[PDB]
Paper text:
RTX adhesins are long, multi-domain proteins present on the outer membrane of many Gram-negative bacteria. To expand the reach of the ligand-binding domains, RTX adhesins maintain a central extender region of multiple tandem repeats, which makes up most of the proteins’ large molecular weight. In this study, we analyzed extender regions from two additional RTX adhesins, including the long adhesion proteins from Marinobacter hydrocarbonoclasticus (MhLap) – an oil-eating marine bacterium – and Aeromonas hydrophila (AhLap) – an opportunistic pathogen of fish and mammals. However, all the tetra-tandemers have at least one calcium ion coordinated in the linker region between beta-sandwich domains whose role appears to be the rigidification of the extender region to help the adhesin extend its reach.
Calcium SAD phasing was used to solve the tetra-tandemer structures to 2.0 Å (MhLap) and 1.75 Å resolution (AhLap). The repeats are rotated relative to each other around the long central axis, producing a handedness to the tetra-tandemers reminiscent of helices. Both the MhLap and AhLap structures show right-handed rotations, with pitches of approximately i + 3 and i + 2, respectively. Alternatively, the AhLap repeats possess a more involved connectivity, resulting in 50 Å-long beta sandwiches that are held together by one four-stranded and another five-stranded beta sheet. The AhLap tetra-tandemer coordinates many more calcium ions throughout its length than does MhLap, although the number of ions per repeat is inconsistent. Each inter-domain interface contains, at minimum, three highly coordinated Ca2+, labelled as calciums I, II, and III. Of the three, calcium I has the fewest coordinate bonds to protein-based ligands, with two positions in its six-ligand octahedral coordination sphere being taken up by water molecules. Both calciums II and III have pentagonal bipyramid coordination spheres, comprised of seven protein-based ligands each. The three Ca2+ are all coordinated by a combination of Asp, Asn, and Glu sidechains that are conserved in every repeat of the full-length adhesin (except the Glu in position 7, which is a comparable Gln for five repeats), as well as backbone carbonyl groups. Interestingly, several acidic residues (namely ligands 3, 6) use their bidentate sidechains to coordinate two separate calcium ions at the same time, making calciums I, II and III part of an interconnected coordination network. The AhLap structure was solved with two tetra-tandemers in the asymmetric unit, meaning that the structure holds eight repeat domains with six replicate interfaces between them. Of those six, four of them hold an additional calcium. In fact, the AhLap tetra-tandemer appears more rigid than the MhLap, with both angles remaining closer to the start angle over the entirety of the run.
Residue numbers in the entry: 22 to 446
Write the structure that this text describes.
């Protein structure tokens, strides 16, 4: 027996996903046999596969071979990855030939799932705000590709924080708490970070930062003073508060209107958006305060976000002169008694500065120049004048001598008692 000569197309190629559901390749082999044309033909049927062939090859008597493989079975091949399969065909005689099929893989996108959102709040921790989560990845091109590229996610424009992921998919977002202070209550900033699997398939993690209120910082003039009777009918005090607010210029101003007064305040205070305050009180309401006596009134004002500050006003009293009345005159007549001529009367005092000032300094009245007599007064206002009858004898019938005595209330207010001495023969 002489071996057939088998020639023609004995190689073929299919690419993953070139067609569906089958990848198919064809070729024709030709056979000549020197033992005659009954031998110069192929055994029709399946070629004998290499071990671990996924595809199959059939050949006709005429040498027309077809390779078929399920596209589903070659998905695991990565971009450019080759699998070579061989099939043995034979002459009617038994002379063998091999057909060589190459399968070439294409990339399959990774499938990325799991936690791809997170949230941090201003001041939840310090100095760093942290969020964590886990992505997971599958990739039909194999365990080699079913992994993240470890490192930083590519940040959105103007992101404050950063995100790192591990090969297993564990991500960590961190932002400096100092950098998010400027966000107001419930205000949000969204930052995104793009991560990648080995084959360059991307997924986004979206992080929402939420702000909390920062208390305004109020400073400037928060104290003021008025003095009774410095002006009328109002006593007025002004000052300017300043405010900053890290939550922004929207918040760095005052709520215009009245300050909330301390209970028992006699005055009132208004403030402008720009922090200019004005305290007013009716002068008539503070008369009752005595010299140097104080009354402190406080007014609560607020910034836009409700941060409060106190303005403290001190009212200082001044003396009101006592009103002195009652019996401030008296009379004695030469020889009416002996050896003293005596006269009594009672003064009264009332004082706007209070019942505490409604009394006299007890003691001697300050005598007029050349006074013969003298006068004492009690704390209650009862006075007593005495003169020696011997010293008034010189006065003629109906001739008078007027003597005056200055007394004082406890606040220093003076009053005169006037005594008339009348002469006889
Ligand atoms: Ca032969
Ligand atoms: Ca593939
Ligand atoms: Ca892949
Ligand atoms: Ca594929
Ligand atoms: Ca969180
Ligand atoms: Ca804030
Ligand atoms: Ca803050
Ligand atoms: Ca604020
Ligand atoms: Ca007064
Ligand atoms: Ca007064
Ligand atoms: Ca007084
Ligand atoms: Ca008083
Ligand atoms: Ca006389
Ligand atoms: Cl597919
Ligand atoms: Na703001």
């Amino acid at each position: 027996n002489d071996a057939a000569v088998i020639t023609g197309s004995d190689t073929g190629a299919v690419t993953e996903d070139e067609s569906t559901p089958l990848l198919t390749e064809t070729g024709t082999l030709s056979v000549t046999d020197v033992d005659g044309a009954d031998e110069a033909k192929f055994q029709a049927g399946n070629g004998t596969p290499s071990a671990g062939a996924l595809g199959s090859l059939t050949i006709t008597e005429g040498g027309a071979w077809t390779y078929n493989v399920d596209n589903s079975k070659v998905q695991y091949l990565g971009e450019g990855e080759t699998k070579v399969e061989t099939f043995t065909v034979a002459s009617v005689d038994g002379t063998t030939h091999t057909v060589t099929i190459t399968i070439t893989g294409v990339n399959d996108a990774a499938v990325i799932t799991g936690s791809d959102t997170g949230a941090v709040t201003e001041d939840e921790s310090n100095p760093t705000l942290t969020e964590t989560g886990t992505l997971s990845v599958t990739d039909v091109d194999g365990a080699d590709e079913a992994k993240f590229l470890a490192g930083n996610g590519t940040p959105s424009a103007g992101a404050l924080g950063s995100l790192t992921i591990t090969e297993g998919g564990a991500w960590t977002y961190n932002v400096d708490n100092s950098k998010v202070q400027y966000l107001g209550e419930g205000e949000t900033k969204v930052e995104t970070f793009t991560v990648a699997s080995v084959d360059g398939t991307t997924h986004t993690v979206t992080i929402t930062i939420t702000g909390v209120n920062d208390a305004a910082v109020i400073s400037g003039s928060d104290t003021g003073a008025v003095t009774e009777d410095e002006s009328t009918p109002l006593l007025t005090e002004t000052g300017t508060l300043s405010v900053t607010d890290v939550d922004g210029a929207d918040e760095a101003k005052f709520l215009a209107g009245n300050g909330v007064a301390s209970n028992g305040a006699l005055g009132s205070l208004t403030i402008t958006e720009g922090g200019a305050w004005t305290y007013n009180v009716d002068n008539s309401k503070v008369q009752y305060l005595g010299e140097g006596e104080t009354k402190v009134e406080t007014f609560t004002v607020a910034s836009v976000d409700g941060t409060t500050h106190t303005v403290t006003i001190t009212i200082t009293g001044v003396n009101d002169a006592a009103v002195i009345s009652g019996s401030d005159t008296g009379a004695v007549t030469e020889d009416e008694t002996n050896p003293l001529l005596t006269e009594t009367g009672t003064l009264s005092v009332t004082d706007v500065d209070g019942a505490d000032e409604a009394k006299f300094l007890a003691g001697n009245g300050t005598p007029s120049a050349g006074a013969l007599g003298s006068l004492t007064i009690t704390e209650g206002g009862a006075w007593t004048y005495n003169v020696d009858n011997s010293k008034v004898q010189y006065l003629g019938e109906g001739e008078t001598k007027v003597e005056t005595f200055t007394v004082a209330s406890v606040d220093g207010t003076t009053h005169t008692v006037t005594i008339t001495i009348t002469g006889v023969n």
